[PDB]
Design a protein around this ligand. Structure first.
Ligand SMILES: NC(=O)c1ccc[n+]([C@@H]2O[C@H](COP(=O)([O-])OP(=O)(O)OC[C@H]3O[C@@H](n4cnc5c(N)ncnc54)[C@H](OP(=O)(O)O)[C@@H]3O)[C@@H](O)[C@H]2O)c1
Ligand SMILES: NC(=O)c1ccc[n+]([C@@H]2O[C@H](COP(=O)([O-])OP(=O)(O)OC[C@H]3O[C@@H](n4cnc5c(N)ncnc54)[C@H](OP(=O)(O)O)[C@@H]3O)[C@@H](O)[C@H]2O)c1
Ligand SMILES: NC(=O)c1ccc[n+]([C@@H]2O[C@H](COP(=O)([O-])OP(=O)(O)OC[C@H]3O[C@@H](n4cnc5c(N)ncnc54)[C@H](OP(=O)(O)O)[C@@H]3O)[C@@H](O)[C@H]2O)c1
Ligand SMILES: NC(=O)c1ccc[n+]([C@@H]2O[C@H](COP(=O)([O-])OP(=O)(O)OC[C@H]3O[C@@H](n4cnc5c(N)ncnc54)[C@H](OP(=O)(O)O)[C@@H]3O)[C@@H](O)[C@H]2O)c1
Ligand SMILES: [K+]
Ligand SMILES: [K+]
Ligand SMILES: [K+]
Ligand SMILES: [K+]
Lengths: 441, 440, 441, 440
């Protein structure tokens, strides 16, 4: 009588275990699904586990900050849709009744990132189990200890609820070699990749159904009609949240010249440290960029204080982002730093900002933000930029369900088109036609 | 001048469609509506309808003229338009949120020789309705009819002021062209309607892909069924377009107590029963290959024609060839796509369901059941987990011809989209207006 | 001085107090509504108050039993829809964006039944407050003490939650004369009536928007294809639930002759006491009927043990209903007894049973039940009888959400056509048209 | 032989509709679709369309022919058919639950002289779509045009194989006949499109009744609005059908900074501004009664007509009569239903919203606002709480002409149905299949 904890020595064993679990899960009720989904929430939302997970992940990856991981972890456990997300469509007429249902895929193989290692395990497992699947996690090696502990905790709770063993599994030695082994396993029916563009292309080359949640470079546009004070507060909060490691965070400002100066003034009131010295700006570049001009790993997810500390500047906790006005070609603008480093580009009109916001978004079709009260301008940018998420007059994280209407998720699929994934995304659509019967209108 | 939609190289076609898509983004929803209506008019024009139905059967040698008239009309009438692109909305204290269906870009579509014109009509309507351009990569066996339809569509759209090259294809449809479309960097989405090899290929391209694979639809008949009604439905669904629809019945699983009565009524409604094993081996030698798969020359041929090729002369009233064989028999396991319908006898309805899942080969495509017991209909529908499940009717009722719902000719099982429509070819986007527009 | 407890001396004072409160309620947020809705749930689902309410109702009215009010009150508190029932429809296109919302009516005047006194208040208040209304409750004289107590407990919880005073109010001495005043008070902008056919025609004659939950006479049809063992168990549970005082409970069996005997056999196994002596059946009629021929108020809602004991028959607690086979003309068939007395009419064919079920239903179009595994026959009866609720192969209370899919209500509108009332039913449909803006598809 | 739908007595019509509705229950949804379409063909037929529009203004003396063509066409094109009767479904461990829209029975509709043909066409399509029969009780003034429409409908329905008397009316429409219909026990639901007195009476008949009340729609223009676009939209919406449509603009509330520039642009789009109070006092004496309410002889007359009745000659370019009066002015406070548009100047947008609510008289019918500030647009929509709210467009954009959504000519403020359609004329029914058909 040895109950599994869900962590296996090899990827092949994890997949076979999750496959057998999926067959048994098919014999369960929707009520059973709901109890297991509620068990996952209970795990992450238990105040102790919540605090450990949040602190443990920041320590192991060095990315993010504790207080905001508490919020994001809670957001995942509280506002990830459950079985209620699996609605039913019905059409009744002379030819009978037709029902359309969301049924399970089978064994799903999920690949999680280093920025949100626990939040993405919580969100994926809740939605995938709600849809009747089993999930194999290939986590980032840099998030091994915390990712594996969370899996063990989930299995523990699920075992106490009488669930079939191994609904959620991972490997004891997370590595890229194991990810590839999962991507190649015949019994994996669907891949869900949350990471960079290189990962998204890989899973879309396996011969399997695959949801790809790629990267972005979210611009935020502030036009002359905007509540500048509010925009400044929303932009600093949105940019500095979790030290800018959320895929939706603001990562460049495109301000209309008429209001640019007053914006910068209010930015500095809300904790923005403006770098005006072109020599100090070069020190920051040397610190955060690599030879290839890309973000330096050791700096990703560090506070603005820490980053300024590294170049000999000492500031207090009130400073949340580092701010600089630079040309549109600057690397900080072009690159996805994932740091509380926020460039600002000055443009003449609101239409110029929209054009440059589309250009600098690099056609990721991911996220973009705009501050403005003119319904016409809000409509124009939203229509043109064609991003999976578009926030107006609020912090970027309002698109995640924290501050805006809608549920929350941590797998945002721009490329593959599924949008803000939920249990619906991890389900096959089925049609059931009862001919000339059950039409009782 | 103005493009007829056909190009010499695949790279030329994709580039043309890519620019048309950019131009298409400037058009209104009203423009999409007219262009969609234009495609309906092209195929619902009685003369073009008859020409396309006849020309398709002649070129591919598969199907029959009268039933192509029905399928082509279904694709043009019941394929959803821009009304399929609905808007979700949530409003509360944090303002308003909208969820919309937006364009994917340039879509490359591979279409089947069995339903060459129906798929082009169904695909393009939904794809252009979602704001996309489409590059079609037909198969060689249907080259002429597919190119004629593309040109006709480009004509009608040009008369409606549409950006040129919304629907394009190459002059020499070939396998190497398909592989080029699959690799071109401007193709944002692939849509494959065909066999398992095509669906796996398309899913190995590093692109978003919809895979509408093959099936082996079993029809289960239990002891609670209306036997003579089930006999008529089975024969109609099986022989429709000579069985080349991916959803048509292709093997019967009958409970033993009613099997003799089912066979009886099947013969009363156009089934030629084969009881002599000598003739059964003849039919196998004709329609099977050395490896054991369906013979391409026999696919899509009527029951009369097939029987003629083994010296049996019957009248037009015969629509299917029926035989009672074991479950391991080739006709059961293989997707013949012919009006040849093997029957397998089992003891109980539970054994029928178990065998129905096995014989479906995890294609998870289509299954049929005849039964009046609501508990048994529910059991089989839940367990077989196919994309379409039809109860107490012909298989084509799940296509929207005799059943509720819209119609499609690309049914995605592996990739899970179900019955593809305009929504299938769109990305979901979310628009959050923070703390405004909540007017409740 | 102190906050109102919700009870007022005159009806005018309560309508005025609710009119002011509803205006203050417009200044509240959807998040506030949710807390107020959750407050009502917390009140009735508080284990002590739950038992207290279930006990008081049965004692003060003499109808129902304690164990089953525990369930009905819990159902009303757990499965009544909240604010989430107020969806939003959107339409985007060339002409812009159209929203359709559910908005408040204002002050709602609600008349509750003596049979379901606490359950209707919980259900009505939740739905009406979720929609942004204030409710004036006009309970019947019998349920005075329990009604005022629930109203006082609601006002108490809402006050702690910071709500405006007097969102839920009633009068100190409920009476027919107070109900009439409420029905004619100008500031009352909607009437929701849960009761008999007289009350429904009254509110529909006041010159106000009125919802009318009428009476019924639910027949249960059993044909030859039905699982008879389960049918008997379900019919007994559904008929005896709360001693038959729920408006949806089975109140006459229409059995196909071929299975009528085996049905009666299993009914007896499941707690049915059959009366075969016509002299004994006569004693029951003299007890439960009036001179006019209607149900005796004294006997409404009493258990089967009680009713038998009052004609000199003692039985143990395993008896739940009194069964007798009678002609269709019998008064137990024609009358809505609201007692655990269940007649059985034998017919030849299932088409005969369907024809008779329609007749006996008396065009109430309220509730009906059928037991059958034939999909053709289930459809036939459902289409033809055209009732607001139709239940198949289960106890009648599955239409209430207790054993069936959907939410729960205790105000089922047949005449006015709103169906299973919820928050939507107490809200006005509004259209907002943004011309040529916010069409960001 | 076949009835034409017109009956001498009310009891005969209601009895005929009752019998018709019984026979209607046996018809398929396909039949309803056909009957619904048949009504669309009746009014969209160009000859009838022009006949009805012309015959209506001539008989009633209200509105004008050009705009009745648009409204009648709107009623026939954009009134939802049977597709409005959607089905909700919930499936789980406890089985399947369907929610359907079923018929009420016999509906008694009361149509206004303002929109006599439009209301009949809209109500009949929706009521027949839901599966009901309708007994129309027109007003005396529109008798001839109403009865001609009913007769054309019964003719076309009779050709389509419909049960006789799905749509009926009486030969001599009167108030006694309206009261008879209200009391008849076989009338299951009453639908009232008219003034407040009608709504109260119909809600006192002991029946289910939808009441479409009156409105006094204000239009708020604030300093963030496109003044040129606003001036053009206001004149067009106010003058449309000479202001008889219940949703049309009937008073302007303008913020002070833009009031003069708004008046300036209103005149450039067809507004004759009155500044001589002596002339205003003439208009008051013409278009009002001794009591102070609208004069029935002036309702629905063009601005050119109303101006000539006080010795002022203008050409067909003048569409409305403009004047800036204080809040208490009769024009402002009364639902004139004439192209007479008063303006009230206010200091801030907040003052305008407060006055807009005040002047709307709690009818909660219609309100319009011109602004680009998403925050201020939201504030007025949230607070005024009207059934229809239009932002940055002419009022009639709420009827579906110029805005998103379907069209209706019965707008229920008091009873809360909103923009009525086939759904509004149906009962909600729940069907519960316990522990079966849960096939997910
Ligand atoms: N749209 C969203 O929902 C979302 C959410 C969060 C983050 N992101 C984005 O993802 C990135 C987050 O950081 P990250 O470093 O953890 O992402 P990552 O660099 O792509 O790595 C994630 C996983 O992908 C593996 N991987 C990468 N390329 C692979 C390939 N060709 N073949 C097989 N496996 C491959 C990685 O192995 P290795 O360990 O060797 O790299 C790792 O296991 C950011 O770009 C962020 O914008 C997106
Ligand atoms: N799920 C759906 O929605 C759906 C719909 C329709 C069909 N299907 C499935 O599509 C499949 C239809 O098969 P399909 O053949 O039309 O498309 P396909 O199987 O995917 O591809 C067949 C093509 O390969 C070549 N080919 C096949 N056999 C050949 C042979 N003996 N010799 C030379 N070339 C050969 C031909 O191309 P060349 O022109 O180059 O010779 C032929 O057109 C069925 O399995 C059907 O069930 C699915
Ligand atoms: N569709 C639904 O949702 C629904 C729900 C529940 C009930 N119903 C139907 O409502 C009816 C039950 O309603 P109800 O019982 O609460 O009220 P009721 O039966 O309509 O009448 C009882 C109330 O009215 C007075 N009354 C009438 N007859 C009386 C009598 N013989 N003796 C003393 N008082 C009498 C009493 O008022 P005083 O207290 O002032 O004496 C009593 O409280 C049933 O017909 C039921 O089918 C429908
Ligand atoms: N909410 C809506 O959908 C809607 C639509 C249109 C109109 N209305 C309201 O209809 C009312 C007036 O139209 P009406 O035809 O009834 O004229 P009316 O002025 O209200 O008088 C009704 C009839 O009494 C007398 C005349 O006919 P006889 O003397 O010949 O009998 C007259 O036609 C207006 O107040 C309008 O706001 C509402
Ligand atoms: K950047
Ligand atoms: K086969
Ligand atoms: K009864
Ligand atoms: K006015």
């Amino acid at each position: 009588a040895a109950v599994s904890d869900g962590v296996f020595e090899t990827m092949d064993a994890a997949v076979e275990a999750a496959a057998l679990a999926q067959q048994q899960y098919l014999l369960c009720s929707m009520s059973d699904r709901a109890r297991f989904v509620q068990g996952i929430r209970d795990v992450i939302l238990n105040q102790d586990t919540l605090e450990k997970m949040s602190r443990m992940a920041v320590e192991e990856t060095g990315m993010g900050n504790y207080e905001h991981k508490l919020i994001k972890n809670r957001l995942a456990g509280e506002k990830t849709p459950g079985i209620e997300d699996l609605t039913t469509d019905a059409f009744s007429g002379d030819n009978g009744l037709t029902l359309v249902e969301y049924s399970p895929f089978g064994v799903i193989g999920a690949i999680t990132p280093t920025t949100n290692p626990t939040e993405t395990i919580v969100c994926n497992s809740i939605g995938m189990l709600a849809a009747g699947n089993s999930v194999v996690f290939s986590p980032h090696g840099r998030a091994r200890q915390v990712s594996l502990l969370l899996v063990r905790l989930i299995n523990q709770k699920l075992a106490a609820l009488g669930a079939p063993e191994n609904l959620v599994v991972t490997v004891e030695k997370p590595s890229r070699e194991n990810t590839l082994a999962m991507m190649a396993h015949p019994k994996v029916r669907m891949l869900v990749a949350t990471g960079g563009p290189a990962l998204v292309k890989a899973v879309l080359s396996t011969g399997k159904k695959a949801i790809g949640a790629g990267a972005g470079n979210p611009p935020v546009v502030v036009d002359e009609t905007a509540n500048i004070e509010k925009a400044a507060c929303d932009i600093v909060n949105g940019c500095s949240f979790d030290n800018n490691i959320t895929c939706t965070a603001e990562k460049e400002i495109i301000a209309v010249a008429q209001i640019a100066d007053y914006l910068i003034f209010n930015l500095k009131k809300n904790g923005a440290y403006e770098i005006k010295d072109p020599a100090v700006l070069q020190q920051l570049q040397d610190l955060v960029l690599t030879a290839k001009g890309g973000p330096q790993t050791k700096c990703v997810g560090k506070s603005a204080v820490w980053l300024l500390s590294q170049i000999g500047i000492s500031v207090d906790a009130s400073i949340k982002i580092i701010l600089m006005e630079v040309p549109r070609e600057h690397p900080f603008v072009q690159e996805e730093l994932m740091m509380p480093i926020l460039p600002l580009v000055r443009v003449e009109t609101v239409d110029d900002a929209i054009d440059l916001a589309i250009e600098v978004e690099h056609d990721n079709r991911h996220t973009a933000i705009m501050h403005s009260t003119d319904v016409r301008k809000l409509t124009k940018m939203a229509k043109l930029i064609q991003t999976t998420i578009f926030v107006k007059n609020g912090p970027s994280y309002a698109g995640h369900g924290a501050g805006g209407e809608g549920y929350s998720t941590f797998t945002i699929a721009g490329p593959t088109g599924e949008g803000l994934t939920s249990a619906k995304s991890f389900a096959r659509r089925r049609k059931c036609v009862m001919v000339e019967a059950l039409n009782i209108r």
